[model samples]
Target chain A: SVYDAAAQLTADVKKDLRDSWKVIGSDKKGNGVALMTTLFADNQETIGYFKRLGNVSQGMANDKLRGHSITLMYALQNFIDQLDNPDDLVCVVEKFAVNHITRKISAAEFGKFNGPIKKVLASKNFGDKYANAWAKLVAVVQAAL
Target chain B: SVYDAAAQLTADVKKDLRDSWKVIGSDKKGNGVALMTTLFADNQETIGYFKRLGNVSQGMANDKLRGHSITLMYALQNFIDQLDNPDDLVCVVEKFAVNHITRKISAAEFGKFNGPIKKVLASKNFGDKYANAWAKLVAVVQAAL
Candidate 1:
């Protein structure tokens, strides 16, 4: 059944996240820096969170270019480490797409920011299942906002 | 972060399905008959699957009025029991909704078929987080399809 399959998928997603988080560490500085840069132009709430984490100075948090790139890098690595389930991965990407589109992030910037993650997702081991799901999810977000 | 959330949501959904499955079995014969009659006009695959499970005579399978109700009841329960995520549930409903909207199943018939599952989901405490996540997921599916 789809539910059974989804349950299995969910379990896999949780395991991947827990495992990835362990290796990724809680070094708020590096991860926060990356997240801040990626979201600076689009998500002040996220940027504010990074500041609270002490990963970025208030100035850097508000600095569009600096924070955006850092955040993109963090997102790329995070996504790389959590690619066990195509559906779950797609869900993350969908949320990001919504957030970015809402902030009026340009497609060009979106591509630049997401390019590395896309590259990782496109790798041979990533498989067709993930690629298909990701593409479908992207389309959904694109249409929404 | 989204992966972690998805995993948690998945766990919650599985628990919900387990609970709903129990309710479905409480009065299989009576409930089954009601569901089967409602489903016959729309979903042939589902109808056939139940018929095979019931192992009833050909006459019973053909006698839509009486023979297939028990099987229908069990199958509907199974379907609810099998759903591990709101996406999976949406897939099932989306198919039916499409058929119903296209005049394949009358509004009255669709309501009859859908009522029990709706009651099950509403009554069950699938957890607030999972319910919220599922609501978001439905919009995602609606945009995609």
Candidate 2:
């Protein structure tokens, strides 16, 4: 069950998250802005969602892009916070599906977020150990999503 | 001393945070957007920071404003994540101060975030018990700032 997997965060995994996040999450706003900026830059399809994309400048300082970026970051933080609390985490993921259901985005479409997230994590050197643990967490989260 | 306070999250406090956050943080992006919108609407001074304030409409979908809202949300999540891990949390706070130092924003200016946060929490019905625990956490975090 998704709940089981969500609650299965081992102590080692938690330690990895705690240790790596110290660096990865250190510049929360900057990283989040970078993520959104990178996502838009790399994936052209996603640009259609925001009608004002053309009007908005392509920079970290651009408020419109920055907002979407932070929204995703908050979403990720919700998942991380729920790693040990599967019930809530499951709820959070389901709610995500509900919100996207209106947008008619396929699961694959949703997975587009993965590339930017991983790229950011890799750039931050979240480390193989931490990445492994994060992969497991993201797998369960994606499954639920 | 700040580290000691940051590290002093009791079992009860952790439980309170986890439980209340399940409700308060359920709509991460929405709440974040609301928080910022409320902050700017209530405190006009904040509008000066974002040069494009006059250009942004007061709505959740506005990209520029939405970005700043989520940025603050991520910042809160970092504080929450580091509640028990004082060293990283302290570093997070200090980094915040360092960033603000460049902006020349005083500690009181930073504290402007508190009202919007608490108001959002209140509207969410986080309850008095949860509020008390959160107050303690915010107190320590603010002190470090």
Candidate 3:
């Protein structure tokens, strides 16, 4: 029963994430910046991973931070695309996971990403059930890392 | 390399096809039926093989004709979505192709799809490159069929 529940959850999360991610367009705009800004606002210490955001930066008003988020998002879009193929999925996730290790990225830090981002998406009223879907998908990423 | 060119070509057609098919909409309209109607109009004589439409007729105003087009376009939307995954691609294509059995769902029919649809898209000046890009991908589908 628990296994079935887990499988169902995975399927729902995949469907929800696919729809929500589609909303996060590739435009050089606020969503990506806001995602990072919120992630850091949740924990400034995580900024250590970026190294480029020297001296405790705060928001998208900062050029480098915004640019970094867009580029990171571009790669993330690729990551989602490969999710259906295990070999390609692992290759893509490991590239980031390795970097995450070098920077001491913890599940706790990365896992928190599930929250702030989903909040923005849920606000759009696109899918009511999408409210908590990111939390489940983030766990998948955390495990891979 | 020729391989890279085809890869890029495939990528373009997938993106172009995704947005263009969306124009057909899920509404109970006549576009899909109209498309098939036109195809058949280009040759109602072709239905000599399918052996069903003979009892019926052509044109968008006809209820049977319109419903069938809507149904056909709905299936096509599935075909475009599955283009990237071979198994899924085959899955979607077969839904229509298999029906063409002992008939004609050949590459010529699917491949010729590029011309008029591309005319609509190209006329909009959507992307200068897409006209030919569709021709290339249609070839892929044609080959698969």
Candidate 4:
């Protein structure tokens, strides 16, 4: 059962997730923009997907960028929302795979989000436990992908 | 904060929710249809929302009714998904309120699902604690409504 593995996420991890996300996900678009910027900064190739946005600086003002970032934030919110249920969590991640596959986004590209995601969480002052929980979740999602 | 009250739902209640819902929500459409049937049974007027499907018996086979039932099940699933995060839970419930209000559904009418929800959980052999957790979650959702 997926629960066997997810059980290790622990009640404390769950609490850390809820508390940390309450801050990081509060300004959905702004934080998501920051995440995207961080990703592009470390992995320049990742920015190719949004060439039309004309570099990260100009993209910051682009509504389309903001729109996608908002979607990104909410999708992660959905993931956090289902942390307690392994089956549903995997189902949603599978759904993400389907969507990403259509767009030709490889699993490696998808996993890159973890760097920016945890960086953003760290910036908000969440500790290793919270970041590790997220890394575990990302690994779980990638395994399905 | 909503967490102040939702915290009372406890880690045990969270586990009860995850375990019970895994069984009860497995067959999404079937369980949801059962929930709708139970709802209509106890509150006949509630069936008026789906009057086009004829009586409850006929409505059971109606695809539209089944579609709606699946939606109802997923909506509850969404509620359960955000169980650890009070802010997100309340936000989702608030979204539900907006949609329900547009359809003229009152808070009282919305709460009528609690009875059928618990009955369905009870039928699955979930004990009082599981049922009580659901009742508490329903109350929390209703508080937002």
Candidate 5:
């Protein structure tokens, strides 16, 4: 179940990013190359996968980006795996921040990453608590790196 | 204040051990050699010095063996100075353990190394609690290594 959740989050985040790229009317060829170059640098797949999933985690509140749920689940699982001790969890968070938040992307980009899920945060029924919790979780994950 | 307390403890422990060694026939060449070798091997002076000063803040209780107190103290101070994060404290402990406790130095040997402290502990007035505490402390320090 955890694996499934992570996988789904990963896929959804990528899909959301693709959708946003389309909305901005950016050339898929040029922008794709630029984005890939910036995000991947020396390691293409590592950055690509993480970026795709990070966006999905951010887009958790919006429905369009909701498909990236699997990405987040997987990322979290990966995070847990890296821990040797309780203190190591903090290191994992720091690494996540360095790769996902501070280096490759921005917060609004995260909103786009979570496209559809963003709407969930706006819903009167969903409440701000969940959205805030999600934000805090992301902050910790990023800061730990 | 903490340093003062640690220094007092160190002096007291050393005095006790020195007295004990004398009673145990430390004046004889064979016994003296055996005592010196054991203490040297255990790095008791380093451990006792640090222990006395309550410098086990990084969990490296028994790591600085085979060195004089000044050398170990300088090394430790440098180490604490370089640490960037709170979690890095474990790194210090791990390093200390790898160097000291894993090498099989006994608690009694460590006590003997304190020169005079062994005598104090061996004294009739010293009670089992103090002895037991030192033994436990050595055990804990060893475990951390």
Candidate 6:
């Protein structure tokens, strides 16, 4: 199922995610800040991870959140697009994996943030199947890590 | 006069060139190859300059021409788009100027080649001022050299 989600993510299903991206992607800073803030609020010590945050992760409702969110949404769009094209998926995901390795980050530290993003989206009911597809897609991507 | 065209270029003139780019840019590789080959054909001595041409520039209706053409076309489109935006133009063009310096390539070495492509495009006669705008844009960008 995870493999199906990543490699065989149908064109129609992609349209669903992309259709919502216009709305979600619009609030990039809010989405990113909310995601980061939620993560830290859930565990204050998580602030120590981001050197740029300088242990002030809670103060990140600023440009950092805006930029980081824009970056996140941009990559998510590409990665989501990659789901239907494994070669594209492999090249980009492989690069991400290598970069993470070079930075000495582990899967636990870097992967699965998509889960919270999905949770936030659930408030609006992104349809059960679409959510399942996203979860499966995220799983296989992390599986690469 | 070349410097006059580039540095003295106006926003309206820049828009004129951008308007016709769709047609001119359509055959990116084709245009780039033809432009390159034509410049060399016009002056057999110029063929020897691009080491990559390997004494093959004059008759280079070959594979080597395709990739180089694509690379040239991609950047041309960006610069064309930037003609109206000085800040954007400066960042990219300045980079091109520096890179040219490092490679020992002179501005006069490559910038005005757009002239031949225009001669070819004239068969259809791109917009009234498109030719004039292109001439000015090419002159100015080359003038930077």
Best by DockQ: 6
* Residue-level lDDT tens digits of model 3 in B1-145: 2223235445657777666556643332445545564555565555565443334364554434443444444455445555665543443333344435435567676655665555555545656566666576555455546
Per model, state how many residue pairs clash: 12, 6, 2, 1, 50, 1
Residues B1-145, model 4: lDDT tens digits: 4455566677888888888888987787679789988888899888777764455665456655654565566667766766766655555566555445766877688788878888888788876778788877776655655
lDDT of 5: 0.35
At residue B66, what lDDT does model 2 achieve? 51
Task: Give the clashing pairs for model 2.
Answer: A63-B64, A64-B63, A64-B64, A66-B67, A67-B66, A67-B67
lDDT of 5 by residue, A2-30 (tens): 22223322433434333432332222222
Write candidate 3's Cα lDDT for A43-130 as tens digits: 6666667675544355655545644554456455654554454444443444455546766777777877876677667556655577
Model 2 lDDT tens row, A1-145: 6667666678888777767667766666678777776777789778777665344346654545544544455566656665565555565566555446666766567667667767878888665666677766665655655
lDDT of 6 by residue, B1-145 (tens): 4334456667687667766777777765456667677676676656655675344543434444443554556567656755654544544554455446666667677654656666646744774467777766666656556
Residue A113 lDDT (model 4):
85
C-alpha RMSD between model 2 and the true structure: 13.0
- For candidate 3, the per-residue lDDT at A103 reads 67
Q: Write the per-residue lDDT of candidate 1 for residues B16-76, one digit (tens) a residue.
A: 5455556555665444544444355444544543433343333233433332343334334
Residue B3 displacement in candidate 6 (angstroms): 11
Comparison by lDDT, 1 against 4, better one: 4
Give Cα distance to truth, residue B84, candidate 5, Å.
45
User: TM-scores of all models?
Assistant: 0.24, 0.49, 0.44, 0.50, 0.22, 0.48
lDDT rank, highest first? 4, 2, 6, 3, 1, 5
In the order shown, the chain A TM-scores of the predictions are 0.34, 0.77, 0.77, 0.85, 0.33, 0.73
Q: Mark the 10 consecutive residues where model 4 chain A has the least summed lDDT.
A: A90-99
Model 6 alpha-carbon miss at residue B101, Å: 1.8
Error of 6 at A120 (Å): 19
Off by over 4 Å in 1: A1-145, B1-17, B34-63, B85-88, B96-109, B112-145
